[PDB]
Symmetry: C3
Subunit: 322 residues, 3 copies
Amino acid sequence: WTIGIINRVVQLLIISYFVGWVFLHEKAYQVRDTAIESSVVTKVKGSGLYANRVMDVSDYVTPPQGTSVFVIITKMIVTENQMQGFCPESEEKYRCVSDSQCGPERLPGGGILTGRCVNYSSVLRTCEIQGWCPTEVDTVETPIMMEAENFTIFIKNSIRFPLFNFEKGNLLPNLTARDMKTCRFHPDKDPFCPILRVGDVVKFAGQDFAKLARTGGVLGIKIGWVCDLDKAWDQCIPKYSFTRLDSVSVSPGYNFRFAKYYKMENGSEYRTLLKAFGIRFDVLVYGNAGKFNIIPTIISSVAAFTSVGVGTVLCDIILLNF
Amino acid sequence: WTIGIINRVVQLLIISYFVGWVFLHEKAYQVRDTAIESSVVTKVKGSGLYANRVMDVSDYVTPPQGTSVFVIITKMIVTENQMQGFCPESEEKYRCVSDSQCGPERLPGGGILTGRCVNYSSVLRTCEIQGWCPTEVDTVETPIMMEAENFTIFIKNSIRFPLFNFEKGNLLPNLTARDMKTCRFHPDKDPFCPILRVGDVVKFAGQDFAKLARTGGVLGIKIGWVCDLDKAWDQCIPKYSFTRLDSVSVSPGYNFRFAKYYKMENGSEYRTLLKAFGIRFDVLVYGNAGKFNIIPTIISSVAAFTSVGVGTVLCDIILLNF
Amino acid sequence: WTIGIINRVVQLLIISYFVGWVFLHEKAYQVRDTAIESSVVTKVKGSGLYANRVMDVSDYVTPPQGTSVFVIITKMIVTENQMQGFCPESEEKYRCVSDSQCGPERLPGGGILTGRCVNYSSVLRTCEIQGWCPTEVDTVETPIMMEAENFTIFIKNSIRFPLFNFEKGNLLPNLTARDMKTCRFHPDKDPFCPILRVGDVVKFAGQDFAKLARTGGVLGIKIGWVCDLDKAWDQCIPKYSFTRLDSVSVSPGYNFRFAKYYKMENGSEYRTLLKAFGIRFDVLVYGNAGKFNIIPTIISSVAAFTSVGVGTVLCDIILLNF
Ligand SMILES: *[C@@H]1O[C@H](CO)[C@@H](O)[C@H](O)[C@H]1NC(C)=O
Ligand SMILES: *[C@@H]1O[C@H](CO)[C@@H](O)[C@H](O)[C@H]1NC(C)=O
Ligand SMILES: *[C@@H]1O[C@H](CO)[C@@H](O)[C@H](O)[C@H]1NC(C)=O
Ligand SMILES: *[C@@H]1O[C@H](CO)[C@@H](O)[C@H](O)[C@H]1NC(C)=O
Ligand SMILES: *[C@@H]1O[C@H](CO)[C@@H](O)[C@H](O)[C@H]1NC(C)=O
Ligand SMILES: *[C@@H]1O[C@H](CO)[C@@H](O)[C@H](O)[C@H]1NC(C)=O
Ligand SMILES: *[C@@H]1O[C@H](CO)[C@@H](O)[C@H](O)[C@H]1NC(C)=O
Ligand SMILES: *[C@@H]1O[C@H](CO)[C@@H](O)[C@H](O)[C@H]1NC(C)=O
Ligand SMILES: *[C@@H]1O[C@H](CO)[C@@H](O)[C@H](O)[C@H]1NC(C)=O
Ligand SMILES: [Mg+2]
Ligand SMILES: [Mg+2]
Ligand SMILES: [Mg+2]
Ligand code: NA
C-alpha cells in the first residue's frame, strides 16, 4: 500500500528532524579544544591618599610586573622601626601568670618564647619573645584609601587554541565604541573595552567598596573565549564576567605582611612591618573552541542514522498496536 | 522452535549485560569538563631561628601575597655591604696566570672582566671583574632553619567548572573533624582540613626535611576535583596529594638570589646580596566533572545497540558451528 | 552469481580501507587528556652594563624565584631621592593657565591636584600636585643593556597527565647532543637542551633585540607535550616554540614601575622611582596525551561498521544504476 510509505516517509521526516536538530544544536560534528593558552598583562592607573601620604602605582600595587594576580592595597597597618631583640608580645592569647606557662609546649606554632613572663603593660602580662620589637598591634582601626575606587585596570589578553593553532587578542578597536585610550568597560555600552574601573569591578561582583576595602578581598575578572572556529575570525570574541572568590568560621578579607628593611649608619638593622589589606584581582581566562571534524561528524552521523532506524520501528509498533 | 528464542534471549541478556556494565562504568553518557578554573590563596604561619636572628613570615616567605607558588627560605648565604667597583672574582673557574687569558673571549656568559689578572688571595689568582664587591663565596656551609618544619600552610581554593558553571570551595566545615582554626590535614584522620604542616607535606612527598632544607627543593600540593555533577553538591569533593617536582647531571635543590638595597648618607649605594635556599610550594589544581548529556547518551546507546547486534550474530556462528 | 560477491567483497575491501585508515589516523580509539599539570622553574644567568653600573641577576631579573613569568630589565628610567610634598607636574597634559582649571574635575584618574597652577619651568605652567617630588620625566632617552642578549634562560619543566597519572620532566640527557651544563637549545642541532640564549629566543620570535630592548616586550617560550601514551615512555617528548605575545592605538612595549625605599637618619622617607622596560618571558606549557580505551574503540568500531554498511549500499546503487 502507498499509505504505508506515506506513514514511513512521515516517520522519517519528523523523527529525522528531531534527531537532526538535536545533533546540530550541540555541534556534535565539532572537535573541541578546551585547553586555551592565555597570556595576561595588567596595568593599574591611579593615585590615592592614605593618612597624609600619597600612594601611586609603585606604592599600592603588588606585584609590579602586571601579572594575572595582583593586589591593590586599600588599608594598611604600620609598625615602624622594629629591631631584633626581646619584648613582651602584645597579643592577649600569650597572657601568662608565671614563667612556668611560657615554655615551648605553649603555642607551638607561634613566636619564639624566651621563657620569661613579662609585663607588656600595666593591664596585661604576656610571655616575652625574641624577634622584631616592638611587636605588632593588629587590633587598632586604620583608614582606607577611597581613591582606589576610581583606579583603572587595563587587561591585555593574548590567547591561543593549540589544537587548531588559533591565536587572538582582546584589543579589538573595531568592537569598541570609544577610543581605546579613553574607553571604559561597560557590560552593555562598551563590553570589549579592556579598561575596567576598580569600583565598577567591585560592583559587577556585588560588593561594597567600603567593606571590601576595609577587610580586603579576592575578586576575579573572568575572560571567556567560547568560539566556533567554523565561523569567521571576527566571531571569536571574549566575554567578561566578574565574581568574588573569597566569598564566605574563618575571618573574611585578604591581607599579607611585608617589611621595608633599613640599616643604620653604625650598621644595625631595623625594618618597618606592614600588614596590607587590599583587593586581589585574579584574571581567569577560560575558553573552548569548536571546529568541524570528519570523525565526530561520522560518529554523530551513524548515531542519528541508527537511532532514527530504531525510532521508526518503535513508532510503527506504537501506532499499529493502537 | 521456541529454544531458538531462548538461545537468542540468553544471548541478549548476557551480551547486553556485559556491554551495559562496561558503558555504565565509564560514564559514557556524560559530557566532561576538564578545564577547571581555580583560585588559590595561601597563608604561611610560623617563626624560626637562623643564626641569632628570628625569621617571621615577612622574612622567609616570598612572595608575600599568598599565591599558588611561594618559597619558604630555610638556609641562606649573606654577602653584606657590596658596592660597585673592581675586585678579583673568588670563583676558581676564573683562575688566570696573566692578563692574556682574562679577555672577553673567556667565560662569555659570566661576569664583566676588566682584563687584569689580580690576586684574590695568596693561594688563588683570578680575573678581576667590575660589579658588586666583594664577590660572593657560595662554597661555605651555613645553618638551616629547623623551625620551618613546624610552620603551617593554609590553602583556600575556589574552583569552577565553566562548561556547567559549577563553582565550589575547599573550606568545608562539615567534612572536617576538628574546627578549621585548629585542625590539621591528615590523609586519613582529617583529609579535608586546609591547614598543612610543612614537615607533614615534606613527609607525604617522601622527603627528608634535613636534606631538603639544606639543598632546597620544589614540592607540589596537588588538589584534585574529580566530580560527578549528576550527584549531589555534597559529593563534589577535593582530594589532596603530594609530590616532589624537582626530583632527580644538574645539581638538585632550589635557590635564588635577591639583594637588600641601602644608600649612604653621602649618597653612595651598597647592597646585601642573599642566596636563598628553601622549599618552593606549587599548588596544582586539577579537576574534571561529568554531567549527563543527551548526545553522549545517544552515541553510547547506538554503540551498544549495534555492538550487541553483531555480538549475537558472532555468538550464534560460534555456537552453531560447534 | 559469484561476481555479485566479488563486487561486494571489493566494496568492503576498498570502502573498509578508506574508513579504516581515516579512523586509525585520528586515533579514534584513544581517550585524550588535554589538562596537562605543569611546574616551571626558570634560572637566568648573565651580567650586563648599564650606564657605568653592572647589573647581575639580582638587579635585572624580577621576580627572583624563577617562576613561569619573569622580566629581564633592559632599559630603565631613574628618578632619585623623591619625597612626599607639593610640586608642579612635568607632564604637559597638566598644563594650566589659572587655578580655575586645576580642580578635581580635571584629569580625574591622574594624580592628586592641590588646586594651584604653578610654574614647572619658564616654558611650561602645570597644575601642582601632592606626591613624590620631584615628578618623573619619562620623555627622556636612556641606554639599553646590550649584554642581556647573551644571557641564558634555563627552564626545568615537570608535567603530568592526570587522567593517566603519567608524569615526566624535560631534562633528558640522552636526547641532548652536548652536556646539560654547556649545551644550548637549537631547534635543529639541540632541540631538547633546556638552556636558551636570550638573543636566540628573541630571534625565534622574529624580533629585533635593539627595538625590543628599547621598548620592552612580552615573549612566550611554549613547551608542547603532545604524547601517545600507547607508545614507549621514551616517545613522550617536549617540543619548544617561540612567539611574541604583545605583538601589535596602544603603544607597544612593556614597562612597570617600582621604587627603592630609603629612610633618613632623622627619619624622613625618600625613594628612588624606577620605570623598567624589559623582556617579559611567559613559559606556556600545553600538552595532550592519548591512551587506547575500550569505549572510544567500541564507538569508533560501530561508527565504521554502520558507515561501511551504508556506503556499500550507496555504491551498489551508483554502480547498478549506471
Ligand atoms: C614542633 O612543635 C612541637 C610542640 O608542639 C615541639 O615539641 C617540636 O620540637 C617542634 N619541632 C621542631 C622541629 O622544632
Ligand atoms: C577593523 O576595521 C577595519 C575598518 O577599516 C576593517 O577593514 C577590518 O576588517 C576590521 N577588523 C576586524 C577584525 O574586524
Ligand atoms: C647602633 O646604634 C643604635 C642607636 O644609634 C643602637 O641602638 C644599637 O645598639 C647600635 N648597634 C650596636 C651593635 O651597638
Ligand atoms: C656574546 O658573547 C660573545 C662571546 O662568546 C661575544 O663575542 C659577543 O660580542 C657577545 N654579544 C654581545 C651582544 O655582547
Ligand atoms: C553543613 O552542615 C549543616 C548542619 O547544620 C547542614 O545542614 C548543611 O547541609 C551542611 N552543608 C553541606 C554542604 O553538607
Ligand atoms: C661615600 O662615603 C663612603 C664612605 O663613607 C666612601 O666609601 C665613598 O667613596 C663615598 N662616595 C663618594 C662618591 O665619594
Ligand atoms: C571619581 O572621579 C570623579 C570625577 O570623574 C569624582 O567626582 C568622584 O568623587 C571620584 N570618586 C571618588 C570615590 O573619589
Ligand atoms: C638514558 O640512557 C641510558 C644509556 O646508558 C639508557 O639505558 C636509558 O634507557 C636512557 N633513558 C631513556 C629514558 O631513554
Ligand atoms: C629630615 O632632614 C631632611 C634633611 O636632612 C629635611 O629635608 C627634612 O625636612 C627633615 N624632616 C623633618 C620632619 O624635619
Ligand atoms: Mg601579632
Ligand atoms: Mg660566584
Ligand atoms: Mg608622569
Ligand atoms: Na556511534
